[PDB]
Write a structure and sequence with these properties.
This is part of a larger assembly, with three copies of chain A.
Chain A lengths: L7 E2 L4 E4 L4 E15 L7 E5 L2 H4 L11 E11 L4 H4 L2 H10 E9 L2 E11 L3 E4 L5 E5 L28 E7 L4 E2 L12 E2 L13 H4 L2 E4 L5 E2 L3 E2 L5 E2 L60 E2 L8 E2 L6 E2 L12 E4 L15 E4 L55 E2 L6 E2 L33 E5 L20 E17 L34 E2 L9
Parallel strand pairs in A: 17-22
Antiparallel strand pairs in A: 2-3, 3-25, 4-5, 5-10, 5-24, 6-15, 6-16, 6-25, 7-8, 7-14, 7-25, 9-13, 9-24, 11-12, 18-19, 20-21, 23-26
PDB class: virus/immune system
Keywords: CPV, polyclonal Fab, A site, vaccination, virus, VIRUS-IMMUNE SYSTEM complex
Entry title: CPV Affinity Purified Polyclonal Fab A Site Fab
Chain lengths: ~525, ~525, ~525
């Protein structure tokens, strides 16, 4: 009945050790989840537009027009690293484990309470009211990376949290011509409308069955079993120009000191080794063949248009552009006590060396005259199309058959764990937003909505908005997420880098006198790795 | 459901008897614990600094500079003899038992009620709220005996009680150079900071399971089992002079009265026996060898310091110097009628005579001439380093292989019962603050907190503290604590000291005109025991 | 003859057991080189530095002792650096919480012996033989070579050489303390030998000896330890950190570091218990903590036995107490360094169980708050009129209420195992090594190239035997098994790891000309609660 609990809070992430060095990590997680009633019962399309800001020439990038359906429902998302581990656990996970597998996942909602407000305000308990909860078990509803827009659940155990209002995007026709700064002609920008065949209006009520929870019952999903390719927590020092057997030296140094270098004992037109370019006798460090073209180049800060509108192209690896700029708020790692609407931002400067440096290459004629004095070669310093701000590196691309890349490293606290595989028939090779990829089945989203609570004066046949007793709910969310990991081994003589408490970073990892907290970003991949 | 009770109040102590003179003693106890909501839900880290008070040269021992984590949880701790026994039962314990064992211990929260308030107040039950309760079975949270600051549960079974708000020491580095009133310049008294390797911020949420107890439900701990060594409810009187065969008297007295003392026949220089002084022919009672030293002289009122600041060196026993002094409030022995705020205080002059009379010690030269000559002797009258008030006995220690020590006496009603053995590789011989020491793993502490009840106006994006409904709860606590004691035997001819009620202490043990009750301390180790 | 008798194996393996235990089998092996002993006679020699010591004030320079210089040499592997490279030492301290010593073994293999003909010519000598002896019965006096930094080399690729074994005889001497400016000479005499305390030992009469020609392959079974475990984590709590803090009536309202909290009610009004019967004031300094962490020893105390003066050891400290090491090329100094000065560090341990003598004081029983500058003893006041020596130098607050941790493991020099003393009352801890062999400790291994004499030798000749110039080299391998438990991060916060960074990047990779250096590393990184 009303007076009996149905579940237990649990937040201790447990470690259990298996055969052959495997370790099972059981990230228990729990938190209270507080929900106000919706703005209105109705589904609402809205064409968001910023045409006044977009109309000025030289400002294409700030375009924010889109169409979406505003539902009364609200998503409970736990797909973020901060929800499941504290810095104490992540220090253990990052440092000792090498590989990482996603095993299983579950959820449950217990200890539901509903209350109402009477206007000087006073609070009352509606024991009879109901909370509507729905689980899209079939992945039929459109899937929403709620971590990407920074809508995931809070990370601090003790603070309360809110589920974001759900909102999925609706198709919108568009054309926007770029405009260079100071250009006089007015570019064409217009929202045409919608092409009717792409209209797809989903609902929770028409697609997903809904359980009408009340004050004294709980709902729990079955243990969904993950099926992704395993993630890896180590980075590669090797690159092209650093693969394979280096040349056999002759002039080994006779004394210590960085200024006393070695030399190679034969001239560049005499060396041995299979060269990448066959018409040239200068076998050297840059020209010798390697098995594969690790890392790749792509046009940085390029954009592409479509019926969906403009969007920045993704770059899988980079070395300051390309690296993901992250921004969060008080729920998600910002110093809580600080005032103002501004966010706190960082950029995950990844340890991977695969991101190719911009000005590190050049295009020269096939004849390959090596003493050329930087005048007959397409340097980065030279323009493309006259304007000095654009060179060939802004437009160059390889993506070739020889390419080899590494998956995107995890980002704690605001990185997403799992992601859906694309709708398309031919699929991508890696997803920039998350390390693990849902292969063919993928976890169901959990929605919530307080049921309508209707005043006696209500009429459906009234044109005006319905009248509702002001009602709100808070319930205790809980979920268990299971990993499997391999503890590393000492293959090398040297020490390896570690996450570690330092004199500088000390106060980031403890409460303050006023009681605030912050979670500072930490690097997922630290240990080195080689071709073997 | 809501309307059915979940237990029974029980303070009835039961004396169950066994073979071989052992008696099983079951101390049942129960209190109404009244818990207000936490002042602030967020964890804190507050450092206190009486720089103003300690700035004056001389106030060096008055250092109270420390750091602590202030948690939103509150602690229900049963470490007190007054929590478990009363004057009659304690009388029977002290009088008729000789030895005592700890057997088992359990707690259980039952009959929980939660309630809210509104504005001339209106008190309204909240049938739906939940009380967060956690029992640290794995000993994961740091140990904290509530007895040491007189914050245990109240001793009177009829009156209600409260649990102390819980907190624990964070780390701090500090130096305070002792300076006294004649010193001119200031000492260096500065809070250095916190060493990064020692930050150990614990949290209840991530470390223990938490049960969200509603009004209709119950929590019961399993029967934890002790393994402590037996305590003795009897004291020693034999000191070093009082061990071994007395000397033989050649001439007994032949007339009554105290003035008719006996006489030894053989002169001192020609007596028989053995001494541990290899160049003294004189065998006397002060110089005859005895097998081992009882007690130990140790440097009294010696202060020493480490990274966390100055402190007093503890003492096993004393004879005032070294004896324990207890301060306590209205819940724990002060007469409840009284106005004001001064705690009532006693000093336990323990009955074991293992202490020292420091004004009577002396040291003399190796030669040992018959009467000493003012150069071959150092007395407590003489100074050390020109300080007239300090003699050698302050700076002097006789702990050795031959020091035999008795355990600390139990103290009623404010004495702590059990303590955890230190996690050092080498462990102390005894603890000053209780007779029993937990050997390896030791009873889990119970933490309590009403879950948050939020107002509808809340969102986490506000930097301010959360608005929340003023809730509170009260819950009955039951406890069972088990002992196993040996009944005494009358070996002596004479009767022993026995606790009793007399004309002087008659009103200490019954309520006053307006119900004022005081529970006065009582001696524990009454019966005397032969040491040798 | 021409068949190998072993395998080079330093590949340490980490096998994982149930319940978080891990088995660490530290394989290690070297190439050991032996020179001919300088003389076959068991010479008995006494050292005397009367020239350096007789000048007044130089008490600590006393090197006077007696010993037996044996022809044998000792193959000792009782140090951390011999087994673990820095890579595995990282994985031990950064993950394991506890550590057990399990088992130990040795075998010598691929012995080859050479002769020198004078320019020089080097030739095989198949008649020669390497005498090897193992003190299985623990007869010999234990001589852990980590004490003087004479263990086998810490670099697997380089060869190594062992130390010639020797052991102390008995010697009575008396050396009186002396000032700078004593009136005359102090009594500094050597009093010969007490005949009652003589114990002259030898290997040829105590232990059976094996004569390995070329392919005999001496091998030892697995000696099993029974040591207590060592905890690879440090305690931060001293007194003032044991128990419940006081409750604060006035928390700080505003953010920032300068806003300190405040305790509610006056010092003479607070509740609690004090172990001082005449004082009403509750303070954090006076409140009865459950026991003592650490103790203040007399620091730089020197005491005299019959065998001259020694420094009394100190358990811990915070500088006094901290152990200082010194070592050469083979055991951590950079291999390219000219000269012969040994590199040296002081192991500042993490554990705060030491003491700060500058803050200590004693004062009178009649506790008044503004103490009068009499009735109290500062740490600056002089004992005996000597302005340099204060009361803390002679103080001793050891008691039955005291608690102590073991000495931490020290990498790469630190000793691993040590024998418990034969006395009836054993010491609580051993300050030179973390693990103590409770009743018996693995047998010492001794080695000598057997004599090969020219034909002209006569035993009746007074002169030394004319040995042919011989040497030999053999490969040594040993296995040392541990058991360790992996940690679990209970704290919200992270804790300290051994970690490479920009400052220490170049100390673990070889230099331009192939030099190498092992910097010392911490052991007890993780914090451990005390109470």
């Amino acid at each position: 009945g009303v007076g009996i609990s149905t579940g237990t809070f649990n937040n201790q992430t447990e470690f259990k050790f298996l055969e052959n060095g495997w370790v099972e990590i059981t990230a228990n997680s729990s938190r209270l989840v507080h929900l106000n009633m919706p703005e209105s019962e109705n589904y609402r399309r809205v064409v968001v537009n910023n045409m006044d800001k977009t109309a000025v020439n030289g400002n294409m990038a700030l375009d924010d027009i889109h169409a979406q359906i505003v539902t009364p429902w609200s998503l409970v998302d736990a797909n973020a690293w901060g929800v499941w581990f504290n810095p104490g656990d992540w220090q253990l996970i990052v440092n000792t484990m090498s590989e990482l597998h996603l095993v299983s996942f579950e959820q449950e909602i217990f200890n539901v309470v509903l209350k109402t407000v009477s206007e000087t305000k006073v609070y009352n308990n509606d024991l009879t009211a109901s909370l509507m909860v729905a689980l899209d078990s079939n992945n039929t509803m459109p899937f929403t990376p709620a971590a990407m827009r920074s809508e995931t659940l809070g990370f601090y155990p003790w603070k309360p949290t809110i589920p974001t209002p759900w909102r999925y995007y609706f198709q919108w026709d568009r054309t926007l011509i770029p405009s260079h700064t100071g250009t006089s002609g007015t570019p064409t920008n217009i929202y045409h409308g919608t092409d009717p065949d792409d209209v797809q209006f989903y609902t929770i009520e028409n697609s997903v069955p809904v359980h009408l929870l009340r004050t004294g019952d709980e709902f729990a999903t079955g243990t969904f079993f993950f099926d992704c390719k395993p993630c890896r927590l180590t980075h590669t020092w090797q690159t092209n120009r650093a693969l394979g057997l280096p040349p056999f030296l002759n002039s080994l140094p006779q004394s210590e000191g960085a200024t006393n270098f070695g030399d190679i004992g034969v001239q560049q037109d005499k060396r041995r080794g299979v060269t990448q370019m066959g018409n040239t006798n200068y076998i050297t460090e840059a020209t010798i063949m390697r098995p594969a073209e690790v890392g790749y180049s792509a046009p940085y800060y390029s954009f592409e248009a479509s019926t969906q509108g403009p969007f920045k192209t993704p770059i899988a690896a980079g070395r300051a552009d390309g690296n993901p700029r992250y921004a969060f708020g008080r729920q998600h790692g910002q110093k809580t006590t600080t005032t103002g609407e501004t966010p706190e931002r960082f950029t995950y400067i990844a340890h991977q060396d695969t991101g190719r440096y911009p000005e590190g290459d050049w295009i020269q004629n096939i004849n390959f005259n090596l003493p050329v004095t930087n005048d007959n070669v397409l340097l980065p310093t030279d323009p493309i199309g006259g304007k000095t701000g654009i060179n060939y590196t802004n437009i160059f691309n390889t993506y070739g058959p020889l390419t080899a890349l590494n998956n995107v490293p995890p980002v704690y606290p605001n990185g997403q764990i799992w992601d859906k595989e694309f709708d398309t028939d031919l699929k991508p090779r890696l997803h920039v937003n998350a390390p693990f990829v849902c292969q063919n089945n993928c976890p169901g989203q959990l929605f919530v909505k307080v049921a309508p609570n209707l005043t006696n004066e209500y009429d459906p046949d009234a044109s005006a908005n319905m009248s509702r007793i002001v009602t709100y709910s808070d319930f205790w969310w809980k979920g268990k997420l299971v990993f499997k990991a391999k503890l590393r081994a000492s293959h090398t003589w040297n020490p390896i880098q570690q996450m570690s408490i330092n004199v500088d970073n000390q106060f980031n990892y403890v409460p303050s006198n006023i009681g605030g907290m912050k979670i500072v970003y930490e690097k997922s991949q630290l240990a080195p790795r080689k071709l073997y």
